[PDB]
Every structure is written in structure tokens, then in C-alpha cells.
Design an enzyme around this catalytic site. Structure first.
Site, PDB file in Angstrom:
ATOM      1  N   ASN A  13       0.865  -1.143   0.000  1.00  0.00           N
ATOM      2  CA  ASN A  13       0.000   0.000   0.000  1.00  0.00           C
ATOM      3  C   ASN A  13       0.940   1.242   0.000  1.00  0.00           C
ATOM      4  OD1 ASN A  13      -1.853   2.044   0.386  1.00  0.00           O
ATOM      5  ND2 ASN A  13      -2.509   1.403   2.477  1.00  0.00           N
ATOM      6  N   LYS A  15       0.053   4.259  -0.199  1.00  0.00           N
ATOM      7  CA  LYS A  15      -0.624   5.384   0.402  1.00  0.00           C
ATOM      8  C   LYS A  15      -0.474   6.660  -0.452  1.00  0.00           C
ATOM      9  CE  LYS A  15      -0.302   3.098   4.924  1.00  0.00           C
ATOM     10  NZ  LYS A  15      -0.170   3.295   6.415  1.00  0.00           N
ATOM     11  N   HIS A 100      -9.305   0.512   5.087  1.00  0.00           N
ATOM     12  CA  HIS A 100      -8.091   0.877   5.759  1.00  0.00           C
ATOM     13  C   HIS A 100      -8.395   1.756   6.965  1.00  0.00           C
ATOM     14  CE1 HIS A 100      -3.990   2.174   6.523  1.00  0.00           C
ATOM     15  NE2 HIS A 100      -3.632   1.087   5.876  1.00  0.00           N
ATOM     16  N   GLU A 102      -6.959   4.283   8.111  1.00  0.00           N
ATOM     17  CA  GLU A 102      -6.856   5.730   7.792  1.00  0.00           C
ATOM     18  C   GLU A 102      -8.193   6.262   7.204  1.00  0.00           C
ATOM     19  OE1 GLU A 102      -3.302   5.505   5.453  1.00  0.00           O
ATOM     20  OE2 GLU A 102      -2.065   4.985   7.279  1.00  0.00           O
ATOM     21  N   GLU A 177      -4.679  -5.357  10.581  1.00  0.00           N
ATOM     22  CA  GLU A 177      -3.712  -4.333  10.930  1.00  0.00           C
ATOM     23  C   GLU A 177      -4.118  -3.680  12.234  1.00  0.00           C
ATOM     24  OE1 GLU A 177      -1.603  -2.514   7.231  1.00  0.00           O
ATOM     25  OE2 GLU A 177      -3.598  -1.655   7.071  1.00  0.00           O
ATOM     26  N   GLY A 183       2.420   2.725  11.407  1.00  0.00           N
ATOM     27  CA  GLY A 183       3.287   3.914  11.440  1.00  0.00           C
ATOM     28  C   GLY A 183       4.025   4.162  12.737  1.00  0.00           C
ATOM     29  N   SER A 223       3.742  -1.931  10.618  1.00  0.00           N
ATOM     30  CA  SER A 223       5.148  -1.901  10.851  1.00  0.00           C
ATOM     31  C   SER A 223       5.857  -3.197  10.403  1.00  0.00           C
ATOM     32  CB  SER A 223       5.457  -1.565  12.325  1.00  0.00           C
ATOM     33  OG  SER A 223       5.021  -0.246  12.630  1.00  0.00           O
TER      34      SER A 223
HETATM   35 CL    CL Z   1      -0.961  -0.567   5.015  1.00  0.00          CL
END
Ligand code: CL
Ligand code: CL
Lengths: 263, 256
Positions: A13, A15, A100, A102, A177, A183, A223
Site C-alpha cells: 500500500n 498510500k 483501511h 486511515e 492491521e 506507522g 510496521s
Molecule cells: Cl498498510
């Protein structure tokens, strides 16, 4: 066939990172990588602006392209700023990333996508023949208060309500995830990943079917690095990885190499 | 003299072949584009193909949205203004009523979110087609000026410097005119555009008021564009469904 086993899967990904030249560099890395991708499905998700360039220059059939999101609006019409799953499929893009964390959290003060909105996107995508990397995961607070199994069940159950037919689940890969690993450098332990992935597989078995449970790839993200992937992949229920920041570098090829079991 | 402006918003319509057809239509269009700025907004998937094959200098390309997140980073499914600018895309459409309303049960963009997008886009050197407009209920209950002022004022709070407004074109699209066939009368459009321009003059400056293109959208067609353009404050059009056909060339010709 000779064997019945879940094929390893590594998603990248990218991003909100990309330029014309960096796209070319990543494609050249994937085309020249001196590691065989025979045993692993590899998927890369560039920003939508760069997908056609990747489709034109990528020369590894084993690498497929994905969009990073797909609209609740299934077909063509008056949806300014949305890419529908029908559009994505007709442009020969075989995969999408949905839900996701985010996008569940949202951006700049706009509310994000609820469990129900993610589910609607998933259903629309599958209806148009796409495969879906479905993202789920708990918060640090949820983890520390013992709620992970309850939370992941709620996220997956919303998807099941929108996609109650078991056959549709053939084209889903689940990406676990934990939000606290994204991150932060706080990679899940090998033991925590394996435990939670097995809970996710037990959920598939009870809520959908044992067949869906056995066939569905469950991949870990948060990570992930070349230096931690081999240990993570020792888990019998860890079928590969969803790779964030490391998908922009040469480390991505090391992660692909980790998603193989050799005698 | 404000230069005429015609935008074509393709919305969520496009394939590789239809993109080629539209680009061929724009390349062979038998109108001069000399007196009119033309901008087209393909879905993000097709922008680079349009950039590669478009051979009309007078036509520029746009994205249909741009993120609240300004630069590069961990924003899955977002196109930042920095990315868009570095890909040589000079324009973005922001605050379309479809995006203010939201999709599939997800809440849409508030006045404040739209304003954050505008500021981020202008910070990265983009030009912006800023969309504003009232609902049928708002129109009929006398709230049009209140509503439009709120939408514009949110942007001014985020972009208080009058110089930055040089790169804004305002698109007035009454929600009740979008996709319905109910085109505003030439009189209603001209009146509201003049209200919008008086807002610019009082809130921003007389200079910004005189220079800013205010374009009309909502069921614009080749057959209604000439009458709409007789308004002194109607500087062109934002075209939806007609941007996908040859009718788009007739609309460009009306804004001369
Ligand atoms: Cl990801
Ligand atoms: Cl429009």
C-alpha cells in the site's frame, strides 16, 4: 492440482506517496527483482493517478495492481471525485483495498467510513467482479481492555450482513492491521499475530463456513519490515503481509521473499 | 474583461476508449478556443492519458477533488494537492454538491472541510473551481444568499489573503438544477451571480470581485448556454452530463 494450501500474499500500500519518476523506479524494481514471485500473489496499490502507468510498464504477470479505495456507488454516474468498482474493473484493475484504518478514521474533520459504509463498498466491489483486501483492526485501548475479538467480530459481521452469500467471499483477503501498529514501529509479536489471525479464521468458520475459513488468506500489517517478516510468517494462520512504508523501497522485495515456506 | 471559462466535469464516467474519444473530440473541435479557458476533469484514473494525448494548448486538465491532507504521507485513498501539482495537473474541482452531500451513508464535506481543501490546494500552487449552491428548499424559503455567503465565508476564513483569490473560479450550481433538467432561468442565474459578486466586493475586495470568474452549472446544454451567457455576471459554465458528448463543443462556443 497437486496441493490444497493457501497461497502466500503480499500487498504493498503506497498510500499518498508517488510521482511519475518514483512510480517508474518502483515498477523497475519489481520487474528486475532477482527473487522469484512464483509462490506468492503480489499486489501493489499506487495512488489512482499512477495506476495506468504501472499497468503499462509492469512485466511480471505475478504482480497485480490495486486501487486504494472504491466507491459505495457501484456503477457509472453523477459521483464527482469517486471511482466506482465498475470503472475500476473495466480499466482492468483486479484488486481494491477497502476499510483501511486511515479511511475509517477520516481526514481533516470529515467523518470516516463506518463498519456499514465499508461493508457497502465491499459488496459493490464484489458485485462488479473485483477482489478485495478487506482491512480490520483494533485500537490500543481496545487491545489493552481485552476487546480485540469482540471488535474484529463487529467489523467482520457488518461485512457479512452486506455480503451474506458465502461464494462471494472467494475473492476476499483479510488484512489484520492493529491500529496501534500502523506507522508507530510497534510491530505485533509473532505470537499475537498468530493468535489473532486464528480468531479471525474461527470467526470465518462460525459466521460464514469452514470452507471460507480454510481458503481465505489472512495477512498481517502494521510496521512490517524485511527484518521482522520471517518470524511473523511462522504462524500457520499468517498467510502474508500488507506492507505500508516498506512498499516504497527495496525492503518490499525482502518481505515478498519472507512469505514462502521452504523445506 | 473577464475571460470566459468552460469546465467539463466528467464525474464518475470514463473508460480508456471513451477517454480517447473525448480527447479526439477536443483535438478536432471546429471552434476556436482563443477567447475561452477550457478545463476538463476526468476521473483520476484517466488524467495521465488525457495529459499524454491532448493537443489543444487552450485545454487544461483538472482533478475532481483534492485532499484536506496537503502533502505526501499516510493517507490511504487520498490524492494530495502536492501530488496533483507535481503530476502537472493545474486545476482542481472542490466542494461539488455531490461531495458536500456525501455517498452511501458516509457524511459529506462540511463548509469547513471544503475550505481546508481550498487552502491546501492554493498553498500548493493549484487553481480551484470552487462549487457553491443552494437546495430547492433553501431557494423557496428565501435562504439562497445566506447559504451561499456561508459557503464562501468559510473559504475566506481559511484563505483571508485577497491575492490568493486570483486562482479561484466560482461555480454556482443550484442543487435543484443538477441532473434534473431544471436549468435556471437566465434571469435567476444572472441575479444570483451578481449577489455572489457583491459578496466578493464587500468581504474580499472590489478588485477580486471584478476579476473572479463566476460560472453557472446545472443542466447546461448547447441549446440553453447562449441565453444564459447574456448575463453580465455569468462568465461561463460548469458542464456535467453534456461534457461527455459533442454538445460540450457547442457550450464552449457560447462562452466566446
Ligand atoms: Cl498498510
Ligand atoms: Cl458539474
Amino acid at each position: 492440482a497437486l496441493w490444497a494450501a493457501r497461497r502466500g500474499f503480499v500487498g504493498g500500500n503506497w498510500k499518498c506517496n508517488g510521482t511519475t519518476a518514483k512510480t517508474q523506479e518502483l515498477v523497475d524494481m519489481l520487474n528486475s527483482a532477482p527473487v522469484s514471485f512464483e509462490q506468492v500473489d503480489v499486489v501493489v496499490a499506487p495512488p489512482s493517478l499512477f495506476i495506468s502507468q504501472v499497468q503499462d510498464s509492469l512485466r511480471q504477470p505475478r504482480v497485480q495492481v490495486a486501487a486504494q479505495d472504491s466507491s459505495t456507488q457501484q456503477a457509472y454516474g453523477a459521483f464527482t471525485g469517486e471511482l466506482s468498482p465498475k470503472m475500476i474493473k473495466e480499466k482492468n484493475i483486479p484488486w481494491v483495498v477497502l476499510g483501511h484504518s486511515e479511511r475509517r478514521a477520516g481526514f481533516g474533520g470529515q467523518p470516516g467510513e463506518s463498519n456499514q459504509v465499508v461493508a457497502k463498498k465491499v459488496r459493490a466491489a464484489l458485485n462488479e467482479g473485483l477482489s478485495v483486501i478487506l482491512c480490520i483492526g483494533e485500537t490500543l485501548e481496545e487491545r489493552e481492555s481485552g476487546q480485540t475479538q469482540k471488535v474484529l467480530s463487529e467489523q467482520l459481521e457488518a461485512v457479512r450482513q452486506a455480503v451474506p452469500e458465502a461464494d462471494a467471499w472467494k475473492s476476499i483477503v483479510i488484512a489484520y492491521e492493529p491500529v496501534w501498529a500502523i506507522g508507530t514501529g510497534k510491530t505485533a509479536t509473532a505470537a499475537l499475530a498468530q493468535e489473532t489471525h486464528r480468531d479471525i479464521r474461527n470467526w470465518l468458520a462460525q459466521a460464514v463456513s469452514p470452507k471460507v475459513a480454510e481458503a481465505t488468506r489472512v495477512i498481517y500489517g502494521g510496521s512490517v519490515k524485511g527484518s521482522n517478516a520471517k518470524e511473523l510468517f511462522e504462524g500457520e494462520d499468517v498467510d502474508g503481509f500488507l506492507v505500508g512504508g516498506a512498499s516504497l523501497t527495496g525492503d518490499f522485495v525482502s518481505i515478498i521473499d519472507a512469505a514462502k515456506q521452504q523445506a
